[PDB]
Amino acid sequence: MLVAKSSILLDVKPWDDETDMAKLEECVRSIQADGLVWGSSKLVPVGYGIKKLQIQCVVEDDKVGTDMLEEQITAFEDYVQSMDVAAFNKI
Prior knowledge:
Blueprint: E1 6-14, H1 21-30, E2 37-45, E3 51-59, H2 66-73, E4 80-85
Antiparallel strand pairs: 1-3, 1-4, 2-3
């Protein structure tokens, strides 16, 4: 833990291949907050066409919660099929 920070990996499923991943992957990043750090995202293909919307973030221990990020990322019901959690621990 650098300085009172943590790592939380999120995983969201796109409605379909139509779901502009570039936007989903971007929007996710675009999202900004106080003490909110955006790390590198990951991809996980289920079988071409569609892919997983996995991304990593670095919150401040318990300062920046996923609640917001979720309400922001999953705020798009026209892209996010169903958000979930990949884990919850420090960075």
